[PDB]
Amino acid sequence: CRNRFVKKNGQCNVEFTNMDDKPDMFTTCVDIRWRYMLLLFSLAFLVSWLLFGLIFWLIALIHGDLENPGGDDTFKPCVLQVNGFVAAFLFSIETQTTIGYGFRCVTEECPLAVFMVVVQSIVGCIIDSFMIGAIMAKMARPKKRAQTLLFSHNAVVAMRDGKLCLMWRVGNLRKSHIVEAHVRAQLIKPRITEEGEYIPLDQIDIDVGFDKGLDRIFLVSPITILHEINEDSPLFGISRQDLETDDFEIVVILEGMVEATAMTTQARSSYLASEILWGHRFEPVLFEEKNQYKVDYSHFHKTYEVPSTPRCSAKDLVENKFLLSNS
Amino acid sequence: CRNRFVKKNGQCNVEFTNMDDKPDMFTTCVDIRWRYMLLLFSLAFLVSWLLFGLIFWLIALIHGDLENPGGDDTFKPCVLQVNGFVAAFLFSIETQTTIGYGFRCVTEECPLAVFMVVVQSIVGCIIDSFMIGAIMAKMARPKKRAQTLLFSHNAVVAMRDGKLCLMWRVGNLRKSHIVEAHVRAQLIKPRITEEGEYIPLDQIDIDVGFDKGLDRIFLVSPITILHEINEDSPLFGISRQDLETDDFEIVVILEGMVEATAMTTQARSSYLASEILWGHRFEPVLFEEKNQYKVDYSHFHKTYEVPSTPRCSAKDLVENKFLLSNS
Amino acid sequence: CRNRFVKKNGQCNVEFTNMDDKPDMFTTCVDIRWRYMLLLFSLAFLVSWLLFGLIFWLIALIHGDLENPGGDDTFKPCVLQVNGFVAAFLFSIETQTTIGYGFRCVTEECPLAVFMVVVQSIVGCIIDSFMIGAIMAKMARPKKRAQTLLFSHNAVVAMRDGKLCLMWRVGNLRKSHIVEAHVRAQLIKPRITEEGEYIPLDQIDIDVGFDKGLDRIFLVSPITILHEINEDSPLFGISRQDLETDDFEIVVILEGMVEATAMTTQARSSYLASEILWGHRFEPVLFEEKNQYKVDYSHFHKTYEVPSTPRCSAKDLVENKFLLSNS
Amino acid sequence: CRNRFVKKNGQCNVEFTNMDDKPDMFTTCVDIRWRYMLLLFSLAFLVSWLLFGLIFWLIALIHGDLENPGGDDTFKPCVLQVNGFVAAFLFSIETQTTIGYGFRCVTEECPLAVFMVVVQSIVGCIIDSFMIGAIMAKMARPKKRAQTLLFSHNAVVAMRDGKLCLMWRVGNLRKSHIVEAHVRAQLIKPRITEEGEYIPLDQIDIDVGFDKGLDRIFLVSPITILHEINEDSPLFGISRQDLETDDFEIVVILEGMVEATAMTTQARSSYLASEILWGHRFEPVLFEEKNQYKVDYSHFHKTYEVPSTPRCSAKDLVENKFLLSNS
Ligand SMILES: [K+]
Ligand SMILES: [K+]
Ligand SMILES: [K+]
Ligand SMILES: [K+]
Ligand SMILES: [K+]
């Protein structure tokens, strides 16, 4: 009903505007796209090859080498066979790439031309080294790492061991593991405090076992996360009828160090009130066979009805028992 | 008796099937094997060397260079000494590798041939830089890092300071340390909830001191991890006789940042009910000598009997004391 | 009034003096500046090019090559066309850069000159590889990573849900996320213990929800951090009048793994007593539009008065209620 | 009196013996020393240069090139100017280094020689790329990172705010910070359990505030860590007289992500019973000046006597107060 803060794929639906502007290289490197970075580097080569080509051409002109490029017994050029700009350009390329076919070749005659080969060589090494580093930076820090973690499409409400629970499923799409993996959840909705303060989107924890460490999971086969709805839950007063009427969002988070990518990851998804299925339970995916366990991921998102599920809130379930005792 | 979820070496015994298919480069790089990646790169060289060889050969043909490859006073080729495809191929290799022996050598005559050396040079740099990056990616992120952490073959049950305890041993195989190292444990077995829900493999925490921080260890010499079996333990009602009858698995985990590999690691092992030795204790490994401590790792896995160990459950041990008090 | 320990931008205002001096390469590499490192490497090239140039020149001299550099039917030089130091220098450059124009060229004659090309080649590879590594080290580990996290200029005191609270705002300047993000706060001031010990700057925790996990945040749009001022707070006895009189500093911290830079970050700021605005509340920044949320960052630092805010301390607010009950 | 488990500099004093032997490349790379790795790579160059030199020499021999190395109108060699092994060797070096002076130069004649240049080029790229990677691996993961964290030489016992405390000092030797920094401590000594089990070195936590988060520190200027000695402390029954008699070791740990090195670090030190100074307090190091704070690190390790410090244990201090109340 209201706008969705976090999309089902984890993407946050929030635009930032009217920010402040401040006056690093590593961040700049990984942002720019491939085709743009490769054009940039090929530009850096052209510019250096033209710059030095022009300088060697000038040196040829002033020395009189364009009139006698091969030299003779009386005359030795600065750089053999520089007879024009194209030849000067070729010698620059040949020097910096270090192809050096050698028909065009520097001589001992001109200390400036010697100096210029010394400088071009060093500039060449620098440009190359930066290209290798920029390529590794972008190679090592991509921005489209395909998600390795999966949330179910729906959450459910149902009874487990005498308690009304909100439940969602998480699974790992690879055979590699998640180290120090742990889960969180939040109820997102606006509210006004008793002092009349408006909070556009207040985020209220959904307890999944933090205080006894049980928020920490060892995720091999898909696990079902449990939030007991009790006094302290923000869903304590919500019945099945309140659900289809209500307008709120539950954000769910899984965090951990993913072996596959060697980086700490935050996977996300969202459940609107209208995506929570009261009186449902998830289809098992894990089955034992021969000498090995197996997970059929088709049943990952699938649920089934439990009609014996109470339709009243957890508060009502509690307050019924205290009355069914007095009289 | 039932299938083993996690093998003694940490390997999880679970196959994934019937997954969903989605439409990164860094993950692709580290997966592919050495011999396959090196063939792939040598293929990328061949392809680029043949591509450009063919292009330079075409340019020679159309220019009439194959009939006069050395040139003369009236005729200058695009690229000296390209007299066939093999020569064209050699010039391509020489240019991109930047060997450039120079017998075959580009001239000033043909702006397209000049352009093609410019392009081949840049393509060469790109291919090389990618090869360096791909080699480092795979070098820095291997998938056969020999385990540096060791679990004992067996767990044991025995008394320590008046309490019946489940115990397993962990040790570090190197002189380098594990930063922020800490342990976990779980009882793995299927169960049906009171509402008739089947959980194929429910994972139930085994308390090793999380709530007072004592799950955190400083692991120099092998340490023995302790799980007090009390009210809250899932082994509270299990006696020595129940053990040899029962069918369950205890997964044990050690996590931390390993100095040796500079990465957060999750070491794993498993104990089936039949691998837990009731009434046993581990052989010490740590002995003081001269001015230095020493660990003999032969006694790591070794145990010895304690016949004074009660054979009844922890519940029975408790319920006996309350009765031996009333009368 | 007293000196500020931590500046508003996070910078700590503390100088270290009279330290102890101890007798790594990776830290040395990232510290040195760009222009200084590039001069250092260009120096390393010059030195190696001159060293070997000199060695090849010596070999030429002793062999008699300077008198017959081209050689003939009876005489073969160690290295063709080394007719002086400049030629020797050029051959050294050409060999190590591997330009190798080849007019100057090593021969089969002198095993020492052959040995020296072998050594120079290897030295060349080593120098190059170090340059690539040093450039990546500095590229990957910069010291001017523009802050991606923002604190408000002021903290405020105001009522929320019946409780007097210290509040500051934190926001994320990028669309990328912060993994395992969490907050801390501290009151910094000197004190003397009852035993007469002076602590120049004692750091006293400001509780922002650590014991129930609520110090952990999922930071998409700017969040307001809450410190309930109660019995256990160090601001329990401080009223609005005490604030404008008092002299203390509150340091605020946000920590987490920042996706943008792939590194664990500690963002910092500070609030002097005189920067805390009693009886104020922050301007909302988050507004719903069309099918998307939006953050206007101009209102980030902006506040508004709440005159219904009590001006007495939290202790006074408490002690009033116990009296307004007895009589 | 007994052997010291952890040295004052953090080094653990434990040898491992009689370990099990198992049948990665990245770990192998960072272990080997510089001079040994550089010899290894220079060996890899020699071997490849000799291998291919020999192959090109064979090709010359069988083709009859050693009798006519320059060729003529009727005869074209496989590789020009290969007149012996030294020339063959030179051509191999020139090809793989890609110096390619070009006097020695491959021709179009022999498909095997062409094939061999193709193979040598690729082998060259591979060897080079591995050298760059191995150099970065060792560059990025050194084993002599100079410690950036300092512990005091002594711990002390003294009163703070009505409580008998064990105290040690920690300081940061750089202006860069430690992210998510936190402390631990342990009492190390052997003991026998009531069931007669010997634990060579039992490690018993020393509480420094874990349960309220106060083990976490923001370390700018040197901080003094506090362990309140109470009921739950293992130093509860230890008086000043017991200290000079006792034989135990307290290990102290500081962990966190160090900005300077971009890695999670564990700093260590130790205090033997004989290094704990009862009735002492640390010299302040932090002083306010002008508009800036300053730390004089000379007073870091320095202490001063407090003769008003009780000489009895914390148990005695407690049990005195309950008696001084009854009568
Ligand atoms: K070359
Ligand atoms: K050449
Ligand atoms: K080259
Ligand atoms: K060349
Ligand atoms: K040449």
Query: What type of residue sits at position A236?
Result: F
Domain boundary residue, one of B141, B163, B187: B141
For residue A299, give every residue at least 6 positions away whose Cβ sits within 8 Å of its Cβ, in sequence order, or none: A283, A284, A285
First to last CA, chain A: 42
Judge whether A138 is annotated as a binding position: yes
For residue B42, give every residue at least 6 positions away whose Cβ sits within 8 Å of its Cβ, in sequence order, or none: D122
Question: Which residues make beta-bridge pairs with A62?
Answer: none
Q: Quote the crossing angle between the two packed helices A34-63 and B111-140, to the nearest 10°.
A: 130
Alpha helices (H) in A71-198, listed in sequence order:
85-96, 111-140
Cα(D121) to ligand 1 centroid in Å equals 12
CA A122 to chain centre: 36
**Tokens standing for C267?**
């963002």
* A92: nearest Cα among A68, A116, A128: A116
The whole domain housing A130 covers 15-141
Domain co-membership, C101 together with C206: no
Strand ranges, E, within A207-248: 216-217, 223-228
3-state secondary structure of A61: helix
Domain co-membership, C242 together with C128: no
Domain co-membership, D246 together with D200: yes
**Tokens standing for A199?**
């909070």
Cα(A98) to ligand 3 centroid in Å equals 5
Chosen from A180, A254, A266 to mutate, greatest number of chain C CBs within 10 A: A266
Distance CA A102, CA C91 (A): 13
The DSSP string of B263-278 is EEEEEEEEEEGGGEEE
Q: A137, A26 in Cβ contact below 8 A?
A: yes
**Tokens standing for B86?**
């093999």
Q: Which helix (H) or strand (E) holds D150?
A: strand D149-151
Give the CB-side neighbour count of residue C219, counting CA atoms within 13 A.
Answer: 32
Domain boundary residue, one of B141, B163, B197: B141
Cα distances from D206 to residues C105, C205, C209, D317, in angstroms, run 73, 20, 24, 19
The DSSP string of C93-118 is HHHHTT---SSSEE-SS-HHHHHHHH
Query: What type of residue sits at position A191?
Result: R
Distance CA B272, CA B153 (A): 11
Number of structural domains in chain B: 2
- The counts of H helices and E strands in chain C are 6, 17
Q: Can you tell me which residue has the tokens 């009139």?
A: A67
Judge whether D268 is annotated as a binding position: no
Query: What type of residue sits at position D116?
Result: M
Q: Can you tell me which residue has the tokens 């030299």?
A: A71
**Tokens standing for D87?**
């020339």
Domain co-membership, B77 together with B160: no
Domain co-membership, C186 together with C296: yes
Query: What type of residue sits at position B86?
Result: V
Distance CA B159, CA B164 (A): 5
* A235: nearest Cα among A206, A270, A196, A275: A206
* Burial tier of D36 (Cβ tally within 10 Å: 0-12, 13-18, 19+): exposed
Chosen from C47, C175, C220, C228 to mutate, greatest number of chain A CBs within 10 A: C220
Domain co-membership, B271 together with B256: yes
First to last CA, chain C: 42
Cα(A82) to ligand 2 centroid in Å equals 16
Give the 3-state secondary structure percentages of chain C, helix then strand then coil, rounded to 5. Answer: 35, 30, 35
Q: C142, A26 in Cβ contact below 8 A?
A: yes
Distance CA D84, CA D54 (A): 10
Distance CA A305, CA A303 (A): 7
The reply to whether residue A295 touches residue B194, judged by beta carbons under 8 angstroms, is no
DSSP for residue C291: T
Domain co-membership, B5 together with B59: no
Chosen from B2, B13, B78, B122 to mutate, greatest number of chain A CBs within 10 A: B122
- Number of residues that this document lists for chain C: 327
Domain co-membership, D245 together with D257: yes
Burial profile B2-11: b = 16 or more Cβ within 10 angstroms, e = fewer: eebbbeeebe
Question: Which residues make beta-bridge pairs with C276?
Answer: C155
Q: D184, D208 in Cβ contact below 8 A?
A: yes
The reply to whether residue C49 touches residue A118, judged by beta carbons under 8 angstroms, is yes
**Tokens standing for A293?**
């366990």
Domain boundary residue, one of A86, A118, A141: A141
Distance CA A127, CA C132 (A): 10
Chain C CA closest to residue A145: C259
Positive/negative CA dihedral, A16, A22, A27, A30? positive
Domain co-membership, A4 together with A104: no
C194 at D interface, C-beta within 8 A: yes
Distance CA C298, CA C288 (A): 16
What does the radius of gyration of chain D's CA atoms come to, in whole angstroms? 34
Distance CA D289, CA B159 (A): 60
Total beta-carbon pairs less than 8 A apart between chain A and chain D = 6
Judge whether B138 is annotated as a binding position: yes
The CATH number assigned to the domain holding C327 equals 2.60.40.1400
> Pairing state of beta strands B178-192 and D149-151?
unpaired
* D214: nearest Cα among A216, C184, B255, C226: C184
- The approach used to solve this structure was X-ray
Domain co-membership, D7 together with D26: no
Judge whether B99 is annotated as a binding position: yes
Distance CA D181, CA D286 (A): 20
> Pairing state of beta strands A292-296 and B79-80?
unpaired
Distance CA B140, CA B131 (A): 14
Nearest-neighbour CA in chain C from B142: distance (Å): 20
Give the CB-side neighbour count of residue C325, counting CA atoms within 13 A.
Answer: 6
Question: Which residues make beta-bridge pairs with A151?
Answer: A170
The CATH number assigned to the domain holding B76 equals 1.10.287.70
Give the CB-side neighbour count of residue D216, counting CA atoms within 13 A.
Answer: 18
* Burial tier of A274 (Cβ tally within 10 Å: 0-12, 13-18, 19+): middle
Resolution of the structure in the document, Å:
2.7
Give the 3-state secondary structure percentages of chain A, helix then strand then coil, rounded to 5. Answer: 35, 30, 35
Query: What type of residue sits at position C19?
Result: M
Domain co-membership, D180 together with D305: yes
**Tokens standing for B223?**
């340490």
Domain co-membership, B113 together with B147: no
**Tokens standing for B107?**
């001239």
Judge whether B213 is annotated as a binding position: no
Q: How many other CB atoms sit within 10 Å of the CB of residue C291?
A: 8
Backbone angles phi, psi at B225, to 5 degrees: -85, 140
Backbone angles phi, psi at C319, to 5 degrees: -60, -25
Distance CA D53, CA D89 (A): 4
Q: After which residues, if any, is chain C broken (C to N > 2.5 Å)?
A: 23
DSSP for residue C210: G
Distance CA D183, CA D209 (A): 9
Nearest-neighbour CA in chain B from A89: distance (Å): 9
Alpha helices (H) in A168-304, listed in sequence order:
240-245
> Binding-site residues of C for K(+), please?
98-101
Q: Quote the crossing angle between the two packed helices C85-96 and C34-63, to the nearest 10°.
A: 120
For residue A100, give every residue at least 6 positions away whose Cβ sits within 8 Å of its Cβ, in sequence order, or none: A94, B98, B100, B102, C94, C99, C100, C101, C102, D100
Q: After which residues, if any, is chain A broken (C to N > 2.5 Å)?
A: 23
Q: Can you tell me which residue has the tokens 């050690």?
A: B254
Burial profile C221-233: b = 16 or more Cβ within 10 angstroms, e = fewer: bbbbbbbbbbeeb
Q: D82, D91 in Cβ contact below 8 A?
A: yes
